[PDB]
Amino acid sequence: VEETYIMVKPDGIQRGLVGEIISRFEKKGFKLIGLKMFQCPKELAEEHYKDLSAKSFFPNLIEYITSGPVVCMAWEGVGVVASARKLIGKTDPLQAEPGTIRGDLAVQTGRNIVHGSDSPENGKREIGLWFKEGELCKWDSALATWLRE
Amino acid sequence: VEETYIMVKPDGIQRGLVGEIISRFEKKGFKLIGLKMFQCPKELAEEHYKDLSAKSFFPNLIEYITSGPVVCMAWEGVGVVASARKLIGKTDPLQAEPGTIRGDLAVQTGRNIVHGSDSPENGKREIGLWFKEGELCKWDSALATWLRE
Amino acid sequence: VEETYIMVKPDGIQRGLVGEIISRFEKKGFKLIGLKMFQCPKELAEEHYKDLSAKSFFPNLIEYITSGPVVCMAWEGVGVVASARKLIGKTDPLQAEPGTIRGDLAVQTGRNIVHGSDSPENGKREIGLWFKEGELCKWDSALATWLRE
Amino acid sequence: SMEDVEETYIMVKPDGIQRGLVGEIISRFEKKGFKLIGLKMFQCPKELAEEHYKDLSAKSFFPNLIEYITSGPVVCMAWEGVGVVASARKLIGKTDPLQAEPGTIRGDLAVQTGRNIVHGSDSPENGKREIGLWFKEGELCKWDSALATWLRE
Amino acid sequence: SMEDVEETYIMVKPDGIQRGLVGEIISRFEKKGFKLIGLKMFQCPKELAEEHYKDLSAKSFFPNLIEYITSGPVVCMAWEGVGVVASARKLIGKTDPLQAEPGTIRGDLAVQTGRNIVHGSDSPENGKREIGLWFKEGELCKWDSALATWLRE
Amino acid sequence: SMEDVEETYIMVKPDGIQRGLVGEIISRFEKKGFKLIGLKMFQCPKELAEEHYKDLSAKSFFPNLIEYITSGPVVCMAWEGVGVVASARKLIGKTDPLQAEPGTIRGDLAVQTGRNIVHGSDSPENGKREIGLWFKEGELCKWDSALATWLRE
C-alpha cells in the first residue's frame, strides 16, 4: 500500500501545530505508520535538499530546517501521496486555498509549516531517508472496512 | 422554500461523524426540518439508486447502504440543494477539495460518508421516499432575519 | 446493555446545537441507537413530566418543550445514564461546570438546552414514551473492542 | 526579508454579531498568522455607512444596505501582514455565500449575499482608506509579535 | 422572567494577544450565551493600569505587574447577562492555571499565575468600576439579541 | 517559592491510535502551554512493558497489562514544564472514564477503565524514570520556545 512522508517543519512546532496537523490526516482516514519528533542534523537536511545545493537560498533553507525540532511522519493509504499534497495546499500559504493546512495556518513560503512528498517515488525516498526502517509500525486498523470497500 | 435530502451513510455512523456532519450544515445557516436514525430496507435502497440499477456495482451498493443504520436528514433554505452538494464535495473523496465533508473526512468513493440530493426535484423526491408524512417538522428560526434579508 | 434517553430541547435546535451535542456523546464513546427530530404534542409532554403535574411551573415546563421541535435520542452503553448526566451538568447552567454541556453552552435553568434520564428506570421509561416500535436501531460498533475490554 | 507589509480593514457585519461569530472569525485570521492591530465593537452612524458605501449610493439596494450595516453593532478590525489584503479576501470567500467555497468564512458560515457576515478591503488602497475611515487617531495598536520570526523569514 | 442583567469586565491580558487566543476566548463567552456589548484592542497607559490595580499599589510585585500589563496590547471587553459576573469567573478558572480545572480557560490554556491569559471582574461592583475605567462612556454598544427568547425564559 | 522545570511521560495507549485520537491528545497539551520534547509511534517490546508496569508485577492482572500494551502501536511523549507532572494527570482525569470529569481527556473521550486512552506519569520521579525507559538515549529534543516569556514570568 502506498505511503508518503509528511513533516511538520520547525515553525509548526514553535507555533504548537503538531497535534492539529496530525489530526487532519487522522480524521481524513489515512493510517499513521511512522511518527517522531526529530532534530535534523545538517548533513541529513542537506541530503534531502541535495538538488538545491547550487541555489542562493540553500544556506537559509538548511538553517531553517535545522533551527528547531521537526516532526517526521509516514502515512499509508491508497492515493495518500496526492491526497496529502492536496490537504497541505500550495507551497505559498498566501496562494494555498482556505481549507488546506497552509491556506488556513500559514502566511509565507519560507515558513509554510509542513511538507508532503510530491510523488510516490519521493515518498519512498523520503521515508527511507528520514526514518530508520525499524521505526515504522505496522498495524490493522479496526475501521479499515469502513474507510475502504 | 427549497428543501434537500442529506443522508449520513453507514460508514459515517460507524466512524462517529453524525454530529460533525450535522454541525456543518447548522453552522452554514440552513434549517434542519427532518432527522432520524434509520435502518434502510433493501427495497427503498433500490428505489433510491434506481439510476444505477443496471450497473455492475449496483448489488454491492445496495448491501452497503443496508450494512448498517443511516441518518436521514431534510434541510431547508434558498439554494440549499446546490449548496449542500458543494459542502459535501466530489464523489471521490481523494479528489474532493479540503474544506468539504468528503475532502476533509474520507478517502474512498465506496465509503464517502454522505449523500446530498443533486437537484431540487430530486430533493423533493428523496425526502418523499425516505421520510413519512408528518415526520418533517416545520418551524421558524429566530435568526431568520439575520441569515436572509 | 444500559440505555438512556437524551433530548435536545427547543432552545438547542433554535441555537443550532444539535450536532454539537450529538458529537459530545459520539466522541465520549457511547452508541447512538435512536434519533429523531420531533414536535412534541401537549399530552405527551405532560406524560413525560408526569410526577410534576402538581408543580407550579408545570404549565411553563409544558409550553417550553412544545415551543419548537426537539431532537429525541437513545444512547447505549455501560453506565451511560450516570455518565450522560455528568456530561450534561447541573440543572442551572450558571452552576454547571465548564466542560459540561450546560456549563459551556447555556445560561438559564428555563433554557438549559438538553435533558438526560436521571436513572436507568427513567431511561427505559422515557425511551418507551418518546420512541415508537421499530424506531430504535441496533448495530455492532466496529470500535467496540477499543472502547471496552 | 524586504517584503512590503500592508494593512487591511476587516469588519464583522451586524449578522455576524447576532449569530455569535465574532470570536470564530477573529480566530480564522489569528490562526492564519496575521497580526491584529485594530479591534472594536462599534455602532456605525448613517453618515459613516454612506461614506463607506459611497460607490453604491446610486444602487437600489443601497437604502437597505445602509439600514443593514447600521441595524446593529459591527466589529471593526485592522490586520497587518504581507499580502494580507488579498489573503483576507481569499479567506472570506465570494460575495455570495452560496457560491463561496467550503473552507472560506462565507462558504462555511453564510447563505445569502445580503447577510454575508464579513467584509475585507478589496485592495491595498481601500485598505488604507477604510482603516482611516473606521478607526480614529490612536485606536490602532502597534506591537512586536513573539512568533514573528516563525511566521516570516 | 424578570431578572437583573448585569455587566462584567473581561480582559485578555498581553499574553493572550501574543498567543493568538483573542478569538478563542471571545467564542467561549459567545457560545455560553452571553452578550458582548464592549470590545477593543487597547494599549493600556501606565496610569490607567495603576488605577486598575490600585488596591495592589503597595505590593512588592506591583512594579512588575504594571510593567507586564502594559508590555503589549490587551483586549478590553464588556459582557452582559444574568449572573454573568460569577459565570465568567467560573469559566475562567482559578488564579493558578495549574490548579484551574480542565474545561476552564486557564485550566485548558495556561500554566502559570503570572501569565494566566484573562481577567474577569470578581463582583458586580467591580464590573461596574472596571467597565467605567477601561471603557469610554460611548464605547459600549447595547443591542437586542434575536435569540433572547431562547437564552432566558 | 519557585519550582524547577519538570518532565513527564505521557503515552497514548493502543486504543487511542485505533480511535484516531493521537493529534487531539497532543493538541490538549500543546494548547495548555507545555513543551513537547519527545514523540514517537512505537511498538513496545515485551521486556520494556514489563519494566514499565514493574510496580504492578504482583497483581493478578499484570499479564493482561503486558499483553494489552504490546498488542498494538502506542505513541510515546515527553513533556516539559513547571508542574507538568501533576497538571498532565489533571488534564487526563480519573482512572475510570465514567468518573473522570467533563473537560478532561478521559472524561470527554472514554467510557471504560481498560480503554482509558492515555497514561501520564504519577510522580516526577516516575516521569524521569519512564522517559528514560521509553526513549532511546538520543531521542529527546531540546529547544527554546519563542513564546516562553508569555507562558511564564
Curated annotation (Swiss-Prot), chains D, E, F:
ATP binds at K13, F61, R89, T95, R106, N116. The keyword DNA-binding does not apply. The active site is at H119. The keyword Repressor does not apply. Belongs to the NDK family. It comes from Arabidopsis thaliana (Mouse-ear cress). The lineage of its organism: Eukaryota, Viridiplantae, Streptophyta, Embryophyta, Tracheophyta. It is found in: Plastid, Chloroplast. This is Nucleoside diphosphate kinase II, chloroplastic. Autophosphorylated. The gene is NDPK2. It catalyses: a 2'-deoxyribonucleoside 5'-diphosphate + ATP = a 2'-deoxyribonucleoside 5'-triphosphate + ADP; a ribonucleoside 5'-diphosphate + ATP = a ribonucleoside 5'-triphosphate + ADP. It is an enzyme of class 2 (transferase). Induction: By hydrogen peroxide.
